[PDB]
Amino acid sequence: GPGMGASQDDYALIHKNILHSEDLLKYILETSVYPREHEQLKGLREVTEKHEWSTALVAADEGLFLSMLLKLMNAKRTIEIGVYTGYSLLTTALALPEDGKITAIDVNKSYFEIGLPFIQKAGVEHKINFIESEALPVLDHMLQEMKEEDLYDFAFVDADKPNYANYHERLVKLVRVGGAIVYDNTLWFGTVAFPEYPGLHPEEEECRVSFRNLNKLLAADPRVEISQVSIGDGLTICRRLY
Amino acid sequence: GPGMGASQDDYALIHKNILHSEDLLKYILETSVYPREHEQLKGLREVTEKHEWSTALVAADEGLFLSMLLKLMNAKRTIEIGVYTGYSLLTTALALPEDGKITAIDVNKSYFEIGLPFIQKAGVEHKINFIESEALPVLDHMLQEMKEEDLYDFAFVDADKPNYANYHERLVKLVRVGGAIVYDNTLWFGTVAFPEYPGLHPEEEECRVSFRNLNKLLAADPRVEISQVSIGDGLTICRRLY
Ligand SMILES: Nc1ncnc2c1ncn2[C@@H]1O[C@H](CSCC[C@H](N)C(=O)O)[C@@H](O)[C@H]1O
Ligand SMILES: Nc1ncnc2c1ncn2[C@@H]1O[C@H](CSCC[C@H](N)C(=O)O)[C@@H](O)[C@H]1O
Ligand SMILES: [Mg+2]
Ligand SMILES: [Mg+2]
């Protein structure tokens, strides 16, 4: 209701990790990520860690892994659902070739404007088509208009977690055969391992349930092959088979 | 040579995980791996779990990740250093196209023969050229016979960990530009996060130091881009730049 509003401080899980210690995560970041992180990504990360929804920011080691996947599969056209301040978006734009194209969807353009100066300074703003909207209507609009020549190589899904299964029904048609769909946060702070988990915020409990259902759905889906990867907060890579 | 025993039972770290939660690792395996694991991989894993060097067996969730990488980058010719009973080898042979080829190197073919019946029943033995040898002489011989047109798409490095930096100097010449080298176990039970770690078998301590040195080397190496990934016991993906 009326008041000051929602805080990540209201959330039970924001201090949780899936790795065995903070020291191991910090080792990975300092040894293997920060020396390889573009200066503009570093700047965008540092301002975002002061933001009120900083817990949503994609992990920097996960960022380098997404970049690696994009380059190894020679992706050119991608879609991103859930932009926030733009860390995964700038990661993707830096990884794609000069003529790469990204369709980036987020309900809140004000977050994107936080990262836009870093994206501009990195010289890759020209690859991004940002759409301010709930993602489901955009995807449904694409599906009546897109042709085979416009299919995406890669999709990164990092928006409202309870809608992932609904996004999946559209994305297995919008990503090419042999293309990849990556769902972020599919281990949800480790809570998915438990049929009950005490003391969660109502929205956190909704995601625990939705990810437990989604992980079963993806594992059963004959239209894709999958790999769930314990990096960041967990992600699941899907590769479209037909 | 003479010295102290170095069997798996003499090691300290066998049961340590890099994930905080044994339940979380079990959830990943039960939900996203076992339902997607080839019957012959299951059989090979099960007999290997009973073997005296079971600690060396690649994790099954890591297996599916490697298979995903191979498919997404359309790998066709690969090299594997460190075969053991053949789980990553069978994973790779199943992922490659029907005319794919693997050069598989191990000092001990009796390990390979444990897994060979499963590889044969899977119908993919024909993709494997197994070389019973120390890897370094084989790679040096390859350097003098290999032509530009036969460079490997992908290398998986999982053999004797203190030698990884030596393998790297050959592999950045044996894998094509844009190809991938994957080094297994680069987080070494999480012990790489500390300058010293008490209670280790000397061979375990040697790997801890060699991985701390390797991780710094790879992060500083301009010939590759990298992504260190906290899956299994940790792995580092390298993409050759020139
Ligand atoms: N229905 C919806 N459609 C599109 N975006 C949505 C959405 N619901 C929430 N979002 C957006 O999804 C984002 C999730 S956070 C995304 C993090 C970002 N990918 C990174 O690299 O850090 C938020 O910016 C939120 O505004
Ligand atoms: N110098 C060397 N050259 C080649 N292989 C070696 C080696 N030293 C040890 N090895 C082999 O490296 C293997 C490491 S265990 C490999 C695990 C396997 N890839 C899996 O998927 O489970 C052992 O089989 C060991 O015999
Ligand atoms: Mg996320
Ligand atoms: Mg290994």
Residue in this structure with the two tokens 């042999």, named with its chain if needed: A178
Dist. CA B10–CA B28, nearest whole Å: 29
Q: Return the half-sphere exposure (C-beta side, CA atoms, 13 A cut-off) of residue A235.
A: 24
Count of CB atoms within 10 A of residue B135's CB? 23
The residues that bridge with A77 in the sheet, in sequence order, are: A101
- % helix / strand / coil in chain A, to the nearest 5? 50, 20, 30
Cα–Cα distance for residue pair A60/B50, rounded to 1 Å: 38
> Crossing angle for the helix pair B87-95 and B60-72, nearest 10 degrees?
30
Nearest to A36 among B25, B36, B219 (CB): B219
Helix axes B164-174, B202-220, angle to 10 degrees: 40
Q: Which residues touch B109 (CB under 8 Å, ≥6 apart)?
A: B130, B132
CA of B199 to the centre of ligand 4 (A): 21
A120, A87 contact by CB (below 8 A): no
Sequence-distant (≥ 6) Cβ neighbours of residue B198 within 8 angstroms? none
In A, which residues are within 8 Å of B219 by CB distance? Answer: 31-32, 35-36
C-beta separation of A174 from A138 below 8 A: no
Q: Are strands A77-81 and A101-106 parallel, antiparallel or unpaired?
A: parallel
What six digits make up the tokens of B19? Answer: 């994930």
Cβ–Cβ of B187/A28 closer than 8 Å?
yes
- Other Cβ atoms within 10 Å of A159 Cβ, number: 21
N-term to C-term CA, chain A: 46
User: Is the CB of A28 less than 8 angstroms away from the CB of B230?
Assistant: yes
Residue listed under structure tokens 């996947």: A69
Ligand 1 pocket, residue A41 CB under 6 Å: no
Can you list the domains of chain A with their CATH numbers?
18-240 (3.40.50.150)
Q: Is the CB of B66 under 6 A from ligand 2?
A: no
Q: Exposed (0-12), middle (13-18) or buried (19+): which is B2, by Cβ within 10 Å?
A: exposed
Is the Cβ–Cβ distance between B184 and B213 less than 8 Å?
no
Whose structure tokens read 């690649």?
Answer: B58
Give me B15's structure tokens.
């049961």
**Entry resolution (Å):** 1.8
Rounded Cα distance between B72 and A176, Å, is 12
CA of A62 from ligand 3 middle (Å) equals: 9
Residues in chain B closer than 8 A to A94 (CB atoms): none
Please count the residue pairs, one from chain A and one from chain B, whose beta carbons lie less than 8 angstroms apart: 147
- The answer to whether the CB of A115 falls within 8 A of the CB of A90 is yes
Residue identified by tokens 């070494």 is B188
**Residue B96 contacts A where some CB pair is shorter than 8 Å:** no
Asked whether B136 and B163 are in contact (CB, 8 A), the reply is yes
Which atom from ligand 1 is nearest to the alpha carbon of A135?
A: 3
Of A180, A76, A133, A238, nearest in space to B32 by CA: A238
**What residues have CB less than 8 Å from A98, skipping those under 6 apart?**
none
User: What is the C-alpha separation between A203 and A205, in angstroms, rounded?
Assistant: 5
Rounded to whole angstroms, the Cα distance separating B52 from B45 reads: 13
**B32 vs A28, A69, A215: nearest CB:** A215
Distance separating alpha carbons of residues B178 and B140, to the nearest angstrom: 21
The pair phi, psi for residue A194, each rounded to 5°, is: -125, 135
Q: Tokens for B152?
A: 């490997």
Angle between helices A87-95 and A109-121 (to 10 degrees): 40
Q: Between the CA of residue A12 and those of A190, A202, A204, B99, B232, what are the distances in Å?
A: 12, 10, 8, 51, 27
For residues A207 and A192, give the distance between their C-alpha atoms in angstroms, rounded to a whole number. Answer: 9
